[PDB]
Design a protein around this nucleic acid. Structure first.
Lengths: 92, 716, 249, 735
RNA sequence: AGUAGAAACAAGGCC
RNA sequence: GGCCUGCU
């Protein structure tokens, strides 16, 4: 299992972003520049991201999605997919 | 390829497949595609069975996760994933509970709705061939079969598909996941065809390492290796090698036959030394009986009361005094023990009810007489090494003793009739067959002949004494116990009677091994003066205890009445074998009945009655100074019974050795008397073998004297 | 319910858990025969020596809750001290006789159906007819003869599968009996012993004895029939012949 | 007139009254103390009968070994163990020629058995020398301990459940640098290579008791568990071979022995014409076991297994290879007494190597001085010859080869001989036209025997005309004559239990009536005496008597309670209905129709707490060691009643450091009972497989709960409870 | 002392 | 003095 993340980038605070991972159970983790791994969402959601962020998957496209809304500067991280991907940069 | 099963599948399935791999004993490193194929089969089995539940209805309830409840029934219950023994256990259990038919091969699942089996198999090839293949493998099957194949197609007979279609979409999604993941791997160069059904193995038992060197040191002297010796053996063929060594072997190696003639056999030499002493555990020829004339049977009654009542029947008690000392012990101890026994007997007489079994006081008298606290204390060698006196136990040939004439007279009077019946036989099933009537008549004749015999009285005495002694030893291990010697007979008039020979005091009997010795002291009344044959009473202490008056035409005798007191001992084995003395009756009467049957095979008729009444035929059963004396069949019965009784009484290794080595010579002599040209290779060796068994036992020495007399009378 | 419960209780304690985990099924027999008790060399001597003790026999713990500890006069019937290497308790021989005079009673009607061989022997002898005894030398010649008169023409292994399927239908395994004689024997001995509660092991042993053929070498003179060999001790002797006809004929 | 029974032989031939010459009514001789003296004497005697051999020192065990094979030919009639390899190979070749296909077939069946044999077959044996504790223990216990030690050391091939794999592990253990054992006083001790080699090659020596027919005591040996599998396979091959030889009599019973003896004597005498004379030699072999070299058995087996798979040859050759290097433990030791200080001491035999000789008498001093050079680690090397009839069947094969070597095709002379051999005993019928021919034939037979390491006891042997002879206490005089004195010791209570003793006694009476020509009236007397002894032993008197015992009260109340008192068993104080016609019927079935239904139900109640059945093998089999013979087993007919209890055990283990064995026994028995309740066929057919207990038990719990709901008492509540309890025990076994 | 006979018993061990 | 074992 190889993994490729898409959908990261530079965004406004209070903005929205749709991450996707093309490629079993899946999830999303994030890594901020000063730390190790942080749990985000999986397909459950961590307290720092609950209500804001939704995880979904298509098993006929073979893709797991992370829909992120009302973004904060604290969400600035490399978001990795795992089944590990290389990660997609999200900067808020 | 194994990296795939490292990566994808869960642990549970991989170790299940590894144990299935170990099942049939083939190794995973040589061919792994089978592992992957059957683990995928097992995975489809799970994924098809799980997530499928049922409730009291049919119409399986399907839940993605079993909720906490009693409603966790599984729709399909798995067969495979188990050992062959358990797979067939489940097969048989389902057949016996469901009333269905037993398949001959392994199914994969069972279902309730349709009450039957499922044999799931997903093969690389397309379904529409594998299906009917496995179908013709299985004979006349009602178990429904369902198979998938990688292309994504499904099929089944009856057009039957037993559960939801989304589950089957699951199955084929799993299937193509497998397929286009090997696509990334690239295994189809062999995946379609990797197993062809190979079953072969060679058993290997290789000698190597140390065990090989041992094999190199277990050969004939001039061989260096097991390989060379085996090659020599394989190349060996018979070329007359026994003849060469036979010719070369010295001619002094021979088995020359020495003729055995009438003048060849010489009388067996008997050992010389001090006369032989008495070894019995009770008096045989010099016993005296105090009686009550009660109606009780042998076992019926209480011992102590009967003994006291019998002893009160005699009047004339005197203060006991020493007549013949032990010559090695302390006779005053025996005197005091006798008076103590009398005093405690009176003490029992006074109280309310005679106890069934009495314990005596442990005075110094019986402490010495019973050998108490005399065993050396057991210590460790590291603490006793400088003691000069420390040495082995005395282990040498027993003392040599010459035969005396008392044993001959004792055996003579052990075969004599009596004025009582000493055997009261048990009951048997009423005879129904004529042969049973013949047997009963024969048995009645022998009982009439042997019941009035001192041998039977000795049998009963020994049996009772040894039984009581063993029971007391096993029950009262610690404390000294009193046991009166009791034997019950029946007079000619028919009145039952009890007889009290004396008393036995049993001592400490903590017997662990079959050879451990329990010591007791025996006291017996008698009238035989010990001043006439002192050498026969070396180990006895004899007192004078009273006077007896037996009615005789010479006024009335008013004879003295002495007490033979001694310290004796026995063991568990000796007690057990002495309590089975009744088989002497068997031995003897089996011999007599064999005689009767052998003679009756000549004349076509039972010959018992005339043998026992007419008494015309007689057998040599003893020698008198005039010559050999013959007696009727009854006397032969009594003689053989006495011989067996004395064998049981004076048993010893000497007796066994002499019996064997003298039976050999008896057979040789019989062959000589039969004109069969007997021969021997070393007769002196046989004689030396016989003569080494005769050391000090009176019985074996008497047997040797009898054998010498038989040789003298034979060989004529 | 219970069975898995003592299973869990056993697995609770570490030692029994280890024994259950590391021990494989094949070693079952070994550990089952694992004992410190030597086989007696002289049984008669010790049977005559042990019976003089109090509490010389052994019985299951359940005896402590069916038979009172003492009888009317106070003679003890059982003790609570367990045997050397077992949970059974040592008890007195009176506890046997007590069980035969006030112990629980059952319906022994099916024992005749189980112990078929012995009851058939009894029935055969009860209806036998004896005859005159003829005294003449018998030329006893030694011959191989079958002693079991009810053998169903089956060997040990051949009837062992039948016995399992009759008693232990689930542990048969691969074997499904082909011969139709075995089919009828299974049917008969299944419907006959359907609820008998003596013991599976004794039922299997007696079925093995009844169906399996067994042969031994004996000195015979005449006869040679299975029914005439069981009474060989009563019909033939050293110098006498007793004509006999068992009840079967 | 003086009575003399022996004079009876002047009218009755010796064999017609030979029973009188068997004093089997008294206690047989027993040994009292150590058997170390006998062991040392046997070792020295075995080594000095082969003194002229050649000495070597094993590079593995470091022990001195004496090889007499191919040594100088004997020049005297004394016993000699100088067997010649070529002569014995030629004898085996002639045996094969006279019986073509014998070796190949026997090897085929032996190969089948070896490759299908299981490990559990080793449990079916009597005492064996466990090396884990250096003591004799039951075969099953020793096997379990050795398997545990092997598994702890890393040898787990025996988990395959095959005896061949167990032997593979045993051999692999020989090449290990350091093994570990357990000792209780638990301490883990390390055994180096040489120490373990000697512990696996050693034998335990004891003194034989209850041996009737000789003044002196003898010593016997018991091997370990590593070597018993090879011995089993070798003896299987030897038995398969001897079963094809009519001249052998070891693998058969007594009646077959008599039949073969009669056949051979008739064949030899009848075929002999008027011109040929016939003579029978009743021969015994002196020092039979001490003069049989294991190397010669190795030669015989490697000749037998020619043109066979090499693995079969290796596995069958391993046994004699180990016997050739066998060691013997000296014994218990020696006990000393000091009368001056009034004490006693017990020194173990292992100190004989270094202990001073001031404590020993002259005879023992010299024995120790002679045996010391062979002492290695408290045990003496006994390479030259076998100790006690471990290879009985191979010895019988060698004797049969000797017997067949005189079939008149190899004699090349007018004289010829045949006969029957059973180890240590033989009957030899030799025919020749004249006395000179008979003398030459017997001389050549003796000479050939001396070339194979077999000696004829001239002192215990004699030759007469054919028609009268002896063989293993069977006296033939124009037809075998019954003795009945050999079976006399078996007429008492066996000592198993009440019902078992009754059935065994009646069956023994019946058998001795059938075989040993026991008379009808004698049989009735035996029944009466046996019933008397039985009642007096089990305290079960007629009940209508006033014999007060520890059991006379309950018996009397049962008597007064019963209405039809004729149905009461003798064990419960009832009348005896046995007779000559009823000796083949169990007591329960003979009194079945007379019992009251209440007493009948109380007696034969399955729920009785007394009856205990362990395995199919021990249901109605009683091991009675017969007098003058090896231990034997008998099938006795009995009905499982409340009287079928099993007696108390020893109970002396509680005072020994080996006290934990009882706890292990209890736990193993609890687990076995649980498994049996889970697997009812555990007893009748021993389960097989490679899974562990809890897996099978939990999985069968799953399935049985399931199906017993699909019809039965279980309910959904209970079924789910069982399922989740199974899960609970699963996660418990996880941790 | 006694039993017994090529070595033992005439209680053992543990506190 | 108290308690344990009797083929280990």
């Amino acid at each position: 299992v190889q993994l490729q993340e898409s959908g990261g980038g530079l965004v406004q605070a209070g903005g929205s972003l749709r991450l996707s991972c093309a490629a079993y159970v899946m999830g999303w983790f994030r890594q901020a520049p000063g730390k190790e791994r942080e749990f985000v969402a999986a397909i459950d959601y961590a307290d720092s991201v609950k209500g804001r962020f939704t995880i979904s998957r298509d098993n006929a496209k073979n893709t797991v999605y992370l829909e992120m809304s009302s973004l904060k500067p604290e969400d600035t991280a490399v978001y990795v997919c795992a089944a590990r991907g290389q990660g997609t940069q999200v900067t808020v | 390829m194994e990296d795939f099963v490292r990566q994808c599948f869960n642990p549970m399935i991989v170790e299940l497949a590894e144990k299935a791999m170990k099942e049939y004993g083939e190794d995973l490193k040589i061919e792994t595609n089978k592992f992957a194929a059957i683990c995928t089969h097992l995975e489809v089995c799970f994924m098809y069975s799980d997530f499928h539940f049922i409730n009291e209805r049919g119409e399986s309830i399907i839940v993605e996760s079993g909720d906490p409840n009693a409603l966790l029934k599984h729709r399909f219950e798995i067969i495979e994933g188990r050992d062959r023994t358990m797979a067939w256990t489940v097969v048989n259990s389902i057949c016996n509970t469901t009333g269905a038919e037993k398949p001959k091969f392994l199914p994969d699942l069972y279902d309730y709705k349709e009450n039957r089996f499922i044999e799931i198999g997903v093969t690389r090839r397309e379904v529409h061939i594998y299906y009917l293949e496995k179908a013709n493998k299985i004979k006349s099957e009602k178990t429904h079969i369902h198979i998938f194949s990688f292309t994504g197609e499904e099929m089944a007979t009856k057009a039957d598909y037993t559960l939801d279609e989304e589950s089957r979409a699951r199955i084929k999604t799993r299937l193509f996941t497998i397929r286009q993941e090997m696509a990334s791997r690239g295994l189809w160069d062999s995946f379609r065809q990797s197993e062809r059904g190979e079953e072969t193995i060679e058993e290997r038992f290789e000698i190597t390492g140390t065990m090989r060197r041992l094999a190199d040191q277990s050969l004939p002297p001039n061989f260096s290796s097991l390989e060379n010796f085996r090659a020599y053996v394989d190349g060996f063929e018979p070329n007359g090698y026994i003849e060469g060594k036979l010719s070369q072997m010295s001619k002094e190696v021979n088995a020359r036959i020495e003729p055995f003639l009438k003048t060849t056999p010489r009388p067996l030499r008997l050992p010389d030394g001090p006369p032989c002493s008495q070894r019995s555990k009770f008096l045989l020829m010099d016993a005296l009986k105090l009686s009550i004339e009660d109606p009780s049977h042998e076992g019926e009654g209480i011992p102590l009361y009967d003994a006291i009542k019998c002893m009160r029947t005699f009047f004339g008690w005197k203060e006991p005094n020493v007549v013949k000392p032990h010559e090695k012990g302390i006779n005053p101890n025996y005197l005091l023990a006798w008076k103590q026994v009398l005093a405690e007997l009176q003490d029992i007489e006074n109280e309310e009810k005679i106890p069934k079994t009495k314990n005596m006081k442990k005075t110094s008298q019986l402490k010495w007489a019973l050998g108490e606290n005399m065993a050396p204390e057991k210590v460790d060698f590291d603490d006793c090494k400088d003691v000069s006196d420390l040495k082995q136990y005395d282990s040498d040939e027993p003392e040599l003793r010459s035969l005396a004439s008392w044993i001959q007279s004792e055996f003579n009077k052990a075969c004599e009739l009596t004025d009582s019946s000493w055997i009261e036989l048990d009951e048997i099933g009423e005879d129904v067959a004529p042969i049973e009537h013949i047997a009963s008549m024969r048995r009645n004749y022998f009982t009439a002949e042997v019941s009035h015999c001192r041998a039977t009285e000795y049998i009963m005495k020994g049996v009772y004494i040894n039984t009581a002694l063993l029971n007391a030893s096993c029950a009262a291990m610690d404390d000294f116990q009193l046991i009166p010697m009791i034997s019950k007979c029946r007079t000619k008039e028919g009145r039952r009677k009890t007889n009290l020979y004396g008393f036995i005091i049993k001592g400490r009997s903590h017997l662990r091994n079959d050879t451990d010795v329990v010591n007791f002291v025996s006291m017996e009344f008698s009238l035989t003066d010990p001043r006439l044959e002192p050498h026969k009473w070396e180990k006895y202490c004899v007192l004078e205890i009273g006077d007896m008056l037996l009615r005789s035409a010479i006024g009335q005798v008013s004879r003295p009445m002495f007490l033979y007191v001694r310290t004796n001992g026995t063991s568990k084995i000796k007690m057990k074998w002495g309590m089975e003395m009744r088989r002497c009756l068997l031995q003897s009467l089996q011999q007599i009945e064999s005689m009767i049957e052998a003679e009756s095979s000549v004349k076509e008729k039972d010959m018992t009655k005339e043998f026992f009444e007419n008494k015309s035929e007689t057998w040599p059963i003893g020698e008198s100074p005039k010559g050999v004396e013959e007696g009727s069949i009854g006397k032969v019965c009594r003689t053989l019974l006495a011989k067996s009784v004395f064998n049981s009484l004076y048993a010893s290794p000497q007796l066994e050795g002499f019996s064997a080595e003298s039976r050999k010579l008896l057979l040789i002599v019989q062959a000589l008397r039969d004109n069969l040209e007997p021969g021997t290779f070393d007769l002196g060796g046989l004689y030396e073998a016989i003569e080494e068994c005769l050391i000090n036992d009176p019985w074996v020495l008497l047997n040797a004297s009898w054998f010498n007399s038989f040789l003298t009378h034979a060989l004529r | 319910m219970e069975r898995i419960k003592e299973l869990r209780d056993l697995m609770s304690q570490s030692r029994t858990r280890e024994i259950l985990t590391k021990t494989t099924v094949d070693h079952m027999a070994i550990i089952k025969k694992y004992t410190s008790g030597r086989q007696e060399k002289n049984p008669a001597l010790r049977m005559k020596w042990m019976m003089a003790m109090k509490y010389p026999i052994t019985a299951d713990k359940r005896i402590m809750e069916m038979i009172p500890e003492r009888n009317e006069q106070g003679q003890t019937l059982w003790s609570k001290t367990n045997d050397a290497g077992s949970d059974r308790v040592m008890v007195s021989p009176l506890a046997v006789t007590w069980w035969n005079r006030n112990g629980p009673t059952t319906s022994a009607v099916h024992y005749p159906k189980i112990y078929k061989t012995y009851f058939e022997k009894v029935e055969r002898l009860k209806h036998g007819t004896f005859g005159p005894v003829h005294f003449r030398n018998q030329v006893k010649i030694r011959r191989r003869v079958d002693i079991n008169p009810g053998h169903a023409d089956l060997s040990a292994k051949e009837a062992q599968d039948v016995i399992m399927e009759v008693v232990f239908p689930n542990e048969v395994g691969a074997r499904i009996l082909t011969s139709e004689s075995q089919l009828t024997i299974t049917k008969e001995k299944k419907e006959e012993l359907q609820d008998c509660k003596i013991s599976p092991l004794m039922v299997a042993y007696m079925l093995e004895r009844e169906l399996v053929r067994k042969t031994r070498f004996l000195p015979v003179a005449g006869g040679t029939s299975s029914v005439y060999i069981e009474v060989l001790h009563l019909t033939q002797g050293t110098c006498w012949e007793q004509m006999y006809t068992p009840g079967g004929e | 007139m003086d009575v003399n029974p022996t004079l009876l032989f002047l009218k009755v031939p010796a064999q017609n009254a030979i029973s009188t010459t068997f004093p089997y009514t008294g206690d047989p001789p027993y040994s009292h103390g150590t058997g170390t003296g006998y062991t040392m004497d046997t070792v020295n005697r075995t080594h000095q009968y082969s003194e002229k051999g050649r000495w070597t020192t094993n590079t593995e065990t470091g022990a001195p070994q004496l090889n007499p094979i191919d040594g100088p030919l004997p020049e005297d009639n004394e016993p000699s163990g100088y067997a010649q390899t070529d002569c014995v190979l030629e004898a085996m070749a002639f045996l094969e020629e006279s019986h073509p296909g014998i070796f190949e077939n026997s090897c085929l069946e032996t190969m089948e058995v070896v490759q299908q044999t299981r490990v559990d077959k080793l449990t079916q044996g009597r005492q064996t020398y466990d090396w884990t504790l250096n003591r004799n223990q039951p075969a099953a216990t020793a096997l379990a301990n050795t398997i545990e030690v092997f598994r702890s050391n890393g040898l787990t091939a025996n988990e395959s459940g095959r005896l061949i794999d167990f032997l593979k592990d045993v051999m692999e253990s020989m090449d290990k640098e350091e093994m570990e054992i357990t000792t209780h006083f638990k301490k883990k001790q390390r055994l180096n290579k040489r120490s373990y080699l000697i512990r696996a090659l050693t034998l335990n020596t004891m003194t034989k008791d209850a041996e009737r027919g000789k003044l002196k005591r003898r010593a016997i040996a018991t091997p370990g568990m590593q070597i018993r599998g090879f011995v089993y396979f070798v003896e299987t091959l030897a038995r398969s071979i001897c079963e094809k030889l009519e001249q052998s009599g070891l693998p058969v019973g007594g009646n077959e022995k008599k039949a073969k003896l009669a056949n051979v004597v008739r064949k030899m005498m009848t075929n002999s014409q008027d011109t040929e004379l016939s003579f029978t030699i009743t021969g015994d072999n002196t020092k039979w076991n001490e003069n049989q070299n294991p190397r010669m058995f190795l030669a015989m087996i490697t000749y037998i297994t020619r043109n066979q798979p090499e693995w079969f040859r290796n596995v069958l050759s391993i046994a004699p290879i180990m016997f050739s290097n066998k060691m013997a433990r000296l014994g218990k030791g020696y006990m000393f007494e000091s009368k001056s200080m009034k004490l006693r001491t017990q020194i173990p035999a292992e100190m004989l190597a270094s202990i001073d000789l001031k404590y020993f008498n002259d005879s023992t001093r010299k024995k120790i001085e002679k045996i010391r050079p062979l002492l290695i680690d408290g045990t003496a090397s006994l390479s030259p010859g076998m100790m006690m009839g471990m290879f009985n069947m191979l010895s019988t094969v060698l004797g049969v080869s000797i017997l067949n070597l005189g079939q008149k095709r190899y004699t090349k002379t007018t004289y010829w001989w045949d006969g029957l051999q059973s180890s240590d005993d033989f009957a030899l019928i030799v025919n020749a036209p004249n006395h000179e021919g008979i003398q030459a034939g017997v001389d050549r037979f003796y000479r050939t025997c001396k070339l194979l390491g077999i000696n004829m006891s001239k002192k215990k042997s004699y030759i007469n005309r054919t028609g009268t002879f002896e063989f293993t206490s069977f006296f033939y005089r124009y037809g075998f004559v019954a003795n009945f004195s050999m079976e006399l010791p078996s007429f008492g209570v066996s000592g198993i239990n009440e019902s078992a003793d009754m059935s065994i006694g009646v069956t023994v009476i019946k058998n001795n009536m059938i075989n040993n020509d026991l008379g009808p009236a004698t049989a009735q007397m035996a029944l009466q005496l046996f019933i008397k002894d039985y009642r007096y032993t089990y305290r079960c008197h007629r009940g209508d008597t006033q014999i007060q015992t520890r059991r006379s009260f309950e018996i009397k109340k049962l008597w007064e309670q019963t209405r039809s008192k004729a149905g009461l068993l003798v064990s419960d104080g009832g009348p005896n209905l046995y007779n000559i016609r009823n000796l083949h019927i169990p007591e329960v079935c003979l009194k079945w129709e007379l019992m009251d239904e209440d007493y009948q139900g109380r007696l034969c109640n399955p729920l009785n707490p007394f009856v205990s059945h362990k395995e199919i093998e021990s249901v109605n089999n009683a091991v009675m060691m017969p007098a003058h013979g090896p231990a034997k087993n008998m099938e006795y007919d009995a009905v499982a009643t409340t009287h079928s209890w099993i007696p108390k055990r020893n109970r002396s283990i509680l005072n020994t450091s080996q006290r934990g064995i009882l706890e292990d026994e209890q736990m193993y028995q609890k687990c076995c009972n649980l498994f049996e309740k889970f697997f009812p066929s555990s007893s009748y057919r021993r389960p097989v497989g490679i899974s562990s207990m809890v897996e099978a038990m939990v999985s069968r719990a799953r399935i049985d709960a399931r199906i017993d709901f699909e019809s039965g008492r279980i309910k959904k509540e209970e079924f789910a409870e069982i399922m989740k309890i199974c899960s609970t025990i699963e996660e418990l076994r996880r941790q």
